[PDB]
């Protein structure tokens, strides 16, 4: 988080995404804000001018002037509220418009061709992508708009008040006040250097105190078996004393530093301000400004004095806004990292995953109802080769059974099957990403109606395009014997958190009902049909055979060996067996 | 977190712990703070009185009066800084003294007779005890002192300024201003009711947006196998629109509410203030106050006007302090819950652990070198009986081997052995908590020197009491062949995080070196000697036999069966076997 030319360039790009045109609504809010910033400055100076006239009326014991200027203030009261609150409304809307624009751009780039998947399970340059896509966008939009507003308001205030004081007091007044404020700020900043060192030391000691307590907790049983209460007490007490003595020293230093700070920045500023403003008055022979009535002297003094105070407050605010620029730089850096990674992924380039050409080798061809592995060395994307050259085919209507110990390498095969990981040479055949399925032990369950659950990848209008009437959907439910669920929550339209409402067996049955509804070419059964009866398994397998859906199974059960022709076996050290059938066993 | 009489009573007790005497240092800081609060109020009113005299000197074009009162301000400048910063220093010290007193009391009650162990592994009324013992104490002390200061400063300011205005303007002025401020506050609070409802709705929608994104992350592989990019995009976009439309409505309402707030509380307050202060002036026949010079009229007006402003600011601050009282109540409730549980544990009473008399049944006798289970039905403290009546003895010099599948019930036996869990009937014999040992797979390793590691439950002065010279300690290291570690980090005094510096085998060897150094009566070997050679195991077992230390083993290895007389076997359903020896196997 350091401000350079790269920082500004990166802001320019991000803002270009956030301001696409010149006649959008963001430009409308920007001009609205600029107009209200100028109006707000004028309203503030008018209040300064009118307040002294009300007070001169009161002091002069004149009811005419008091009432005249009080009514001027009352009649102008609503306009000031509009000018201030319309500014706030414009700023809030600009933040919200910025958020919507950035989120649309990020998510359009994000939900495209496994990029959401690759971001976490194929790269490591960003963790917790959801946090960065949601929280950082809001924070960045808020920070950029807050910086704009907080640098645009003080700037105008300082310009106007310096211009007016150049005439009321002369160029010497504002210059001397600003010179003192700058010098005092530098001097106090130099004096306040140690606070940072003491602050980090305090945080370190508090961290040590927390860590020691946590250790005493996690190892409470072993300590309890010992009679070590009189020892852990000594250790924690010693750590507490270490922290406490530092706190004394930090408090004493803060007291000493505060004393000088109050004297220099709080009261000598008042003395300098009195000296600066008093020049036109105490100079009885001042050229032209002040040879006037008492009321004129009263008004001129208090107008000038209040202008100096508000000018100095503006200097403080602009300093604060400059400090907030650092946070803006931090948010921009994170967002720029995100945008870079999306650009890398969307073009296939990836780096730092969690040797042949890692970023894709060989070729992939497109065909239907045919899968052909031809010298494809499936491997982890890190480059670690899982196995030697592998070759096998599943031509049509053929079932393959995966057997062996805990695989840890078959997942790689399944991921390359659905383009999830790059190819590593040879030539391979696949359909167009829509003909492959994979149901884990607990299939994916969405939030919404049961019709959404069974029509997951498609919308209702998509179903109408296919013409699948709800009766056929019920038949698919009937085949898996899930038709009774329709009455559980009052029809299809019922919306519930289906992730936990259904039991395991129900989830797998609906998942295969979804498989039935889709009628794809290939599917993977990653040992999911574990909470269902044998009869239903054979019943669904019979449908799969009759329909023509090729199926991959990982059951390993003897009956499933009888129901499958091919088989794959791995020893955990690198090997694979592929043949027609086994007479009795491997 | 609701204020009642119980809340105040609980504060009284906690503060009684925090203020033990009447002549301590806390009472010194309290009187110091009270004196500085009064001085700070007087200094503020003096500045109000002197500022108008400086300004009347400037306006009067009188260098004599300007210089006179400016020098009065300069000469009194250091005293005001002392009065303000000595108040801040006193408040900080009172917070720190409060923290030290409370922490000492809590930890004295906490580290006593397994109470640290029971708090987390025998009850459930508090989780994360370290967080409550460390963070809540600091926050509570800060909150109580902040409430005291922020209710004591505005109170004095309001009293002084109302008293002075009762004479400057009359009782009508302060009364009318306070009446308007109260009425406006009530009216605006009534108008601002919906903001809370909209705020919670906004937080709910943001939570939904975060949850949906997280779901898209955790289920990215299954979605990827599908071509569902065009569906999760629709779901997330719909959720974003739901949030965004609410944000529009919330922004528009905030704009509308702000407009009324500015008009009523920001400017009509100024109009009412002008009307209130102007009464003595515009009344040309005012009885006595104002029949005076222009400078007197100038000074009287601005003194009164500034007093009204600071009185009203004090009303705002006291309102804020009252709001902070709610947080104080929350912290007190948590601390009172902690104190109650420590009191329950320290007397043996416990509730809600994670049927016979759960809180202790039977009796425990004290003896050395003898352990006698007599009809003790060991069970979980929840009351669920693990096994039926159990009886066996380990008289002297006898070794017992535990065998079977994953136990899950032997841990209960070991915990009752070291008084960690209550007895459930019968009569049992144990030594005085100092003769039992238990080394897990990874023994406990402290932060400190190696001498601390081997002398864990004892201090260096304790070792000098026993007279164990460092040569004998080295011999204990030599027996376990850990003498070479002395040169690894430059002698005993080297301090390092021994939790991870040592490898497993080294940790167990030092743990048994600690066992050797202590020479207790009974010890438990929870399958820890797994990363050590067979020769060293026999070598250490020979020492244990020769020394006379009875030993319990959980190895299950055949050679260890040969080296152990008794044995315990559990089937996981409730049973135990205890006999002299086994000819070949169970
Ligand atoms: C219009 C044209 C023709 C020309 C002008 C055009 C402009 C645009 C050109 C110039 C623009 C400049 C101004 C920009 C500034 C920003 C820059 C870039 C960045 C920085 O910044 S530089 C970087 C490194 N440098 C630092 O980093 C330390 C500097 N740091 C600070 O500048 C602040 O951080 C502090 C905290 C020090 C100042 O802020 P602050 O302390 O709050 O101001 P303060 O002095 O308290 O108020 C004023 C006081 O006038 C007194 N007073 C007068 N009259 C009366 C009266 N009649 N009655 C009672 N009192 C009176 C009274 O004492 C009142 O104060 P009081 O009544 O409240 O006690
Ligand atoms: C000494 C003895 C003899 C007798 C007195 C003894 C005392 C101790 C007895 C009385 C103590 C009472 C006072 C205690 C109070 C606390 C109570 C218990 C709790 C509450 O509280 S009740 C609970 C339910 N009730 C609410 O919950 C809504 C109530 N909520 C509020 O009370 C605040 O929350 C707000 C925000 C509304 C008020 O605070 P605030 O708005 O900040 O005050 P504000 O009106 O702005 O300042 C004053 C304005 O005088 C104007 N002004 C005058 N003269 C001039 C001039 N020459 N030039 C320019 N302007 C002038 C100017 O307009 C200035 O203001 P400005 O120049 O800045 O615009």
| In-domain check, residue A65 | yes
Output the DSSP codes for A372-397.
Answer: EEES---B-TTS-B-SS---EEE-SS
C-alpha to C-alpha distance for A101 and B252, rounded to whole angstroms = 20
Q: Identify the residue among B102, B221, B270 best suited for mutation to test binding to A, counting A beta carbons within 10 A and taking the highest.
A: B221
To the question of whether residue B405 is assigned a binding role by annotation, the answer is yes
Flag whether A443 is marked binding: no
- Which experiment gave this structure? cryo-EM
DSSP string, A504-555: HHHHHHHHHHHHHHH--S--EE-S-TTSS-HHHHHHHHHHHHHHT---EE--
Beta-carbon contacts of residue A408 (< 8 Å; ≥ 6 apart): A572
Instruction: Report the distance separating Cα B392 and Cα B387, nearest Å.
Output: 14
Atom of ligand 1 nearest to the CA of A185: 28
- Residue A95, exposed/middle/buried by CB under 10 A (0-12, 13-18, 19+)? buried
The ligand minimizing its distance to the Cα of B265 is: 2
In a domain, A493, yes or no: no
Residue A60 annotated as binding?
no
A568 within domain boundaries: no
Residue B188 Cα to ligand 2 middle (Å): 14
Residue B337 lies in a domain: yes
Count of CB atoms within 10 A of residue B571's CB? 10
Q: Whose structure tokens read 């108040």? A: B87
- Beta-strand pair B392-394/A495-497: unpaired
Give the nearest ligand 2 atom to B155 CA.
Answer: 8
The answer to whether the CB of A313 is under 6 A from ligand 1 is yes
Q: How far is the CA of B87 from the centre of ligand 1 (A)?
A: 27
Q: Which of B81, B86, B434 sits opposite A227 (nearest CB)?
A: B434
CB atoms < 10 A from the CB of B356, how many? Answer: 13
Residue-number span of the structural domain to which A234 is assigned: 5-283+293-346
Q: Is residue B59 part of a domain?
A: yes
Q: From the CA of B65, how far away is ligand 1's center (Å)?
A: 27
**Residue A366 main-chain phi, psi, to 5 deg:** -115, 125
Q: How many CA atoms lie within 13 A of A229 on its CB side?
A: 15
Indicate the resolution in Å: 3.1
Radius of gyration of chain B (CA): 37
Distances (CA, A) of A536 to A476, A481, A482, A513: 13, 9, 12, 12
Contact B70 A271 (CB under 8 A): yes
Nearest Cα to Cα of residue B436 among B502, B389, B385, B366: B366
> Burial of A214 by CB count in 10 Å (0-12 exposed, 13-18 middle, 19+ buried)?
middle
Tokens of A186: 């530098």
Residue of B89, B223, B459 lying closest to A255 (CB–CB): B89
Distance from CA of A200 to the nearest CA of B (A): 18
The DSSP element (H or E) to which B393 belongs, if any, is strand B392-394
Nearest to B570 by CA among B584, B583, B556, B559: B556
DSSP string, A248-297: HHHHHHHHHHHHHHIIIIIIHHHHHHHHHHTHHHH-TT-SSS--S-HHHH
Q: Which atom of ligand 2 is nearest to the CA of B271?
A: 63
Helix (H, G, I), strand (E, B) or coil at B552: strand
Q: For chain B, how are helix, strand and coil distributed in percent, rounded to 5? A: 65, 5, 30
Three-state secondary structure call for residue B364 = strand
d(CA B438, CA B422): 18
Instruction: Report the phi/psi class of residue A242: left, alpha or beta, with left for phi > 0 and alpha for psi in -120 to 50.
Output: alpha
From the CA of B56, the nearest ligand is 1
Which of B449, B454, B518 minimizes the C-alpha distance to B482?
B454
How many domains would you assign to chain A? 1
Q: Are strands A371-374 and A392-394 parallel, antiparallel or unpaired?
A: antiparallel
Q: Which of B75, B111, B208, B518 to mutate to test the interface with A (most CBs of A within 10 A)?
A: B111
Contacts by A533-538, CB closer than 8 A, 24 or more apart: A534/A559, A536/A480, A536/A481, A536/A509, A538/A563
| Residue B566 in domain | no
Q: Is A377 exposed, middle or buried (0-12, 13-18, 19+ CB in 10 A)?
A: middle
Q: Relative to the alpha carbon of B300, which ligand is closest?
A: 2
Q: Is residue A427 part of a domain?
A: no
> Measured between alpha carbons, how far is B211 from B213 in angstroms, rounded to an integer?
5
| Residue B381 domain flag | no
Q: What Cα–Cα distance (Å) separates residue A83 from each residue in A46, A70, A150, B127, B190?
A: 13, 20, 16, 52, 25
| A15: helix, strand or coil | helix
Q: Which residues of A touch B107 (CB under 8 A)?
A: 233, 236-237
Q: What is the dihedral of CA A338, A339, A343, A348, to 10 degrees?
A: 10
Instruction: Tell me the C-alpha distance between B262 and B21, whole Å.
Output: 50
Rounded-to-10 torsion of CA B28, B33, B38, B40: 140
* CATH number, domain containing residue A12: 1.20.1560.10
Give the mutation candidate from A47, A134, A224, A232 for the B interface (greatest B CB count, under 10 A): A224
Contacts of B217 in chain A (CB under 8 A): 116, 120, 129-130
Check if A304 has its Cβ closer than 6 Å to any atom of ligand 1.
no
Task: Name the one residue in this structure whose structure tokens are 């030092």.
Answer: B510
- Asked if residue A97 belongs to a known ligand binding site, the reply is no
Annotation-wise, does A403 bind a ligand?
Answer: no
Q: Give A141→chain B minimum CA distance, Å.
A: 14
Rounded to whole angstroms, the maximal C-alpha distance in chain B is: 122
Q: What is the DSSP string of A414-483?
A: HHHHTTSS--EEEEEEE--SSS---B-SS----EEEHHHHHTTTS-HHHHHHHT--HHHHHHHHHHTT-G
By three-state DSSP, how is residue A566 classified?
A: strand
Residues with CB under 6 A from ligand 2: A 55; B 158-159, 162-163, 178, 181-182, 184-186, 265-266, 269-270, 273-274, 277, 305, 308-309, 312-313, 315-316, 318-319
Q: Which atom of ligand 1 is nearest to the CA of A186?
A: 28
Beta bridge partners of residue B566, listed in sequence order: B400
Residue A290, Cβ neighbours under 10 Å: how many?
17
Q: Please tell me the residue having the least CA distance from ligand 2 atom 48.
A: B309
């Amino acid at each position: 988080a350091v401000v350079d030319k790269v920082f500004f360039s990166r802001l320019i790009q991000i803002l270009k995404i956030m301001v696409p045109r010149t006649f959008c609504k963001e430009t409308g809010y920007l001009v609205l804000i600029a107009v209200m910033l100028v109006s707000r400055t004028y309203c503030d100076v008018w209040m300064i001018q009118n307040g002294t006239l009300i007070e001169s009326g009161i002091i002069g014991r004149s009811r005419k002037d008091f009432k005249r200027y009080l009514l001027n203030f009352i009649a102008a009261m609503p306009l000031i509220s509009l000018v201030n609150n319309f500014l706030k409304y414009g700023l809030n809307e600009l933040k919200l418009c910025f958020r919507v624009r950035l989120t649309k751009y990020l998510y359009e780039e994000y939900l495209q061709a496994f990029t959401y998947y690759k971001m976490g399970n194929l790269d490591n340059r960003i963790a917790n992508p959801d946090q960065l896509l949601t929280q950082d966008v809001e924070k960045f939009c808020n920070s950029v708009v807050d910086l704009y507003s907080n640098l645009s308001k003080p700037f105008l205030d300082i310009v106007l008040y310096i211009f007016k004081l150049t005439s009321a007091i002369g160029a010497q007044g504002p210059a001397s006040m600003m010179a003192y404020l700058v010098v005092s700020g530098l001097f106090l900043t130099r004096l306040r250097r140690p606070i940072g060192k003491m602050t980090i030391t305090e945080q370190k000691y508090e961290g040590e105190y927390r860590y020691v307590n946590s250790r005493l907790i996690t190892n409470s049983e072993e300590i309890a078996f010992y009679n070590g209460n009189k020892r852990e007490k000594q250790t924690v007490h010693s750590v507490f004393r270490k922290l406490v003595e530092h706190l004394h020293n930090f408090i004493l230093f803060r007291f000493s530093m505060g004393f000088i700070d109050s004297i220099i920045a709080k009261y000598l500023a008042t003395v300098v301000g009195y000296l600066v403003v008093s020049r036109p008055f105490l100079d009885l022979s001042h050229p032209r400004h002040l040879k006037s009535t008492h009321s004129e002297l009263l008004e001129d003094y208090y107008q000038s004095g209040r202008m100096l105070l508000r000018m100095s407050q503006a200097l403080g605010r602009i300093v604060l806004a400059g400090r907030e620029m650092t946070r803006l730089a931090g948010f921009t850096a994170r967002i720029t990292e995100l945008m870079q990674v999306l650009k890398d992924l969307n073009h296939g380039k990836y780096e730092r995953t969690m040797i042949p050409l890692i970023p894709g080798a060989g070729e992939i061809i497109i065909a239907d109802n045919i899968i052909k592995f031809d010298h494809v060395p499936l491997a982890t994307p890190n480059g670690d080769v899982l196995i030697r050259d592998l070759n096998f085919e599943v031509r049509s209507g053929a079932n393959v059974l995966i057997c062996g110990p805990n695989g840890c390498g078959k997942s790689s095969l399944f991921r390359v099957l659905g383009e999830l990981w790059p190819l590593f040479g040879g030539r391979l055949t696949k359909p167009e990403r829509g003909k492959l399925f994979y149901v884990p032990q607990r299939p994916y369950m969405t939030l919404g109606t049961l019709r959404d659950q069974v029509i997951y990848p498609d919308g209702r209008e998509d179903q109408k395009r296919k013409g699948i009437s709800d009766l056929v959907l019920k038949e698919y439910l009937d085949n898996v014997q899930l038709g009774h669920i329709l009455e559980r929550e009052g029809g299809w339209d019922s919306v519930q958190d289906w992730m936990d409402v259904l039991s395991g067996g129900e989830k797998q049955r609906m998942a295969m009902a979804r498989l039935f509804y889709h009628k794809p070419q290939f599917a993977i059964l990653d040992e999911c049909t574990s909470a269902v009866s044998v009869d239903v398994e054979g019943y669904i397998y019979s449908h799969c055979r009759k329909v023509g859906i090729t199926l991959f199974t990982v059951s390993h059960r003897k009956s499933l060996w009888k129901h499958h022709e091919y088989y794959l076996h791995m020893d955990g050290r690198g090997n694979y067996e592929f043949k027609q059938i086994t007479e009795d066993t491997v």
